[PDB]
């Protein structure tokens, strides 16, 4: 399932006026604007590969890339991005199907020259996305990566060598991946035939763009190309209340699959569940009555609906009665030593509730164990699952339970007669993490109303201001949300 094949002076073609995208989401009508961004120069020399002899080299990623193709038959499917591309750092895959555009950010181990059979494993998959597919008619794409955000622009124009004329690329995707990218490679589909694609690199430049009456771009001049063009730039020619509005609340976060699980786990082999890319409603599991303990350290109970974190975890146990007091920062007592220990600078919450009606039996559960003998204390958030016999003497055990060779695993005895302090309490611990990456887990955002023909404040999606709102007749482009 891993084939190698390579049986092999690229040409150079002009890019007359190609690769001008929409810098931002603002609707400007009949204006001549000036911009300073990463653009592709005018009359450059783009590289023309026809990798099919067969060879798909790995190319650099200096600041961004402009990629164009003209093959009618669907041969080119997707791209792979990464730093080392060899099973030791995160990598990104955008292979798409006949009706899906699935995107995965995982720890891949790629082949020599992957083709559609590309990778061997996928260890830690930290992202996912599904939507409508991206793909003689020229198709052209622009890829940028800044501040942990991956940005994709694209366009499709029918033609009948790149044409001459002007076409502006509209925004298509913005992802908060967070990985570091410096090399990329394309991948083809083999059941074949010749396939040609064009590659060019972006540079920091300044442009002068022209917005016509309807908000579309129809012309632009590079401000370095000519002594004449430099002159064109200089001449610049060729309270009552407050309403808060916010998008709907859809992507609720899955807290029902942890607090309402059918069967929990032991304490010596506990469970971990990564939670990310969700909207967490922290005030639905506080205003309740089941929980008899909601002890929170590092934050305030009612300030969890205005904060955003990078990551959130969840740990689960079943313990007995008067041991929940040992789950706290700075405790001991044979369950904070050998089973589960909390760091000193904890930032989280601990929630425990009685479950005597589900984990007891007339004879006995005899299913929940705990560690009892160990050589050294546990480091914070460290799990041990082995069952080697604990040697308490000089003579080696040789794996036999005897004189000075204790069995370090004892079972809880549960039955519906013991008093409080011996009945099974289920425990869940929530931990928060924030480091170096864009924050995805966030609380809900409220919305008030819409009053028109009055002098009021407003907070449309974070654009605070004051004035009067009345219906108008202007027509924005679909992706423009600002005005101006």
């Amino acid at each position, epitope marked *: 399932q891993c084939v190698n094949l390579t049986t092999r002076p690229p040409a150079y073609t002009n890019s007359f006026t190609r690769g001008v995208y929409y810098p931002d989401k603002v609707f400007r009508s009949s204006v001549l604007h000036s911009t300073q961004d990463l653009f592709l120069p005018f009359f450059s020399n783009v590289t023309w590969f026809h990798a099919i002899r067969f060879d798909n080299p790995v190319l650099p990623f200096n600041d961004g890339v402009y990629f164009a193709s003209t093959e009618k038959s669907n041969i080119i499917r997707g791209w792979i991005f990464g730093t080392t591309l060899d099973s030791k750092t995160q990598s990104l895959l955008i292979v798409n199907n006949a009706t899906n555009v699935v995107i995965k950010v995982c720890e891949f181990q790629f082949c020599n020259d992957p083709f559609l059979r590309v990778y061997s494993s996928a260890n830690n998959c930290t992202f996912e996305y599904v939507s409508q597919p991206f793909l003689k008619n020229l198709r052209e794409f622009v890829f940028k990566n800044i501040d942990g955000y991956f940005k994709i622009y694209s366009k499709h124009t029918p033609i009948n060598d790149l044409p001459q004329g002007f076409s502006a690329l509209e925004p298509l995707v913005d992802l908060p991946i967070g990985i570091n990218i410096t090399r990329f490679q394309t991948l083809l589909a083999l059941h074949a035939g010749a396939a040609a694609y064009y590659v060019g690199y972006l540079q920091p430049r300044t442009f002068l763009l022209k917005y016509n009456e309807n908000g579309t771009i129809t012309d632009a001049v590079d401000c370095a190309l000519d002594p004449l063009s430099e002159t064109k730039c200089t001449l610049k020619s060729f309270p009552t209340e407050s309403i808060v509005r916010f998008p709907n609340i859809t992507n609720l976060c899955p807290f029902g699959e942890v607090f309402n699980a059918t069967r929990f786990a032991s304490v010596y082999a506990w469970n971990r569940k990564r939670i990310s890319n969700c909207v967490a409603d922290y005030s639905v599991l506080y205003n309740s009555a089941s929980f008899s303990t909601f002890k929170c350290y590092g934050v305030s109970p009612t300030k969890l609906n205005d904060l955003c974190f990078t990551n959130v975890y969840a740990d689960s146990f079943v313990i007995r009665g008067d041991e929940v007091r040992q789950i706290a920062p700075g405790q001991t007592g044979k369950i904070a030593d050998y089973n589960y220990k909390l760091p000193d600078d904890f930032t989280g919450c601990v929630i425990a509730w009685n479950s005597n009606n589900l984990d007891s039996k007339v004879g*006995g559960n005899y299913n929940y164990l705990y560690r009892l003998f160990r050589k050294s204390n546990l480091k914070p958030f460290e799990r041990d699952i082995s069952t080697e016999i604990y040697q308490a*003497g000089s003579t080696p055990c040789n794996g036999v339970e005897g004189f000075n060779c*204790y069995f370090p695993l*004892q079972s809880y005895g549960f039955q519906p007669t013991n008093g409080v302090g011996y009945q099974p309490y289920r425990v869940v611990v929530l931990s928060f993490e924030l480091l170096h990456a864009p924050a995805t887990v966030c609380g809900p955002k409220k919305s008030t109303n819409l009053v028109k023909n009055k002098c009021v404040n407003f907070n449309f999606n974070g654009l605070t201001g004051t004035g009067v709102l009345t219906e108008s007749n202007k027509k924005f482009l679909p992706f423009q949300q600002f005005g101006r």
Partner: antibody
Amino acid sequence: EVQLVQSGAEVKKPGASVKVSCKASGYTFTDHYIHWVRQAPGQGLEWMGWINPNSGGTNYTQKFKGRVTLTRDRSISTAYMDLSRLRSDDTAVYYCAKDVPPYIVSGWLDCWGQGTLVTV
Amino acid sequence: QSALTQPPSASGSPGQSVTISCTGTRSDVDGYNYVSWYQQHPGKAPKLMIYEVTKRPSGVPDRFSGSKSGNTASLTVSGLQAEDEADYYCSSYAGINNWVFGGGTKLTVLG
């Protein structure tokens, strides 16, 4: 107070077998190793071997190897001993016991059963 | 394994002391403190008297007292009565995850 109760007398022949039970009440069953002792009618006590009611591991005297087997059942908290090579020199009285230290083995046998008389 | 030996018989005067002995006990640093003594009356179950050579359990008067030295353990009784008419059994460790008993001593008092 802790109570141990054994079953009644049995009479067998040198081809038969025997099983002895031992019911424990008044304490926590699975926190004490249980030892087995024998006494011929007019001689000194002889040790047999032990059992761990938590795990189930056992160990015997090399003399008895191949003929004796020990088992437990925790739901009703009982321990069973099986012997299956009865001879003329196996008529005796059989006892239970109980260790003092909870999760450790040591022959400080403090509370005893009542004795089953097997007159083969 | 090993084999512990103790005298078949002993006797004492009412008010005197007796020193029923034991020997052959495992003599090693790791496993030194493992000796016990039991008493049986005819037609009954035995009783615990001394464990962990000198530790004594509740319910038995301080007259009974154990000791050990070198390779031999020993029992010591005082204030003998007519009640101390019983058979005493030594007990020790025997190496390969196995414990062993002793022959037994009949303690006799005359009146």
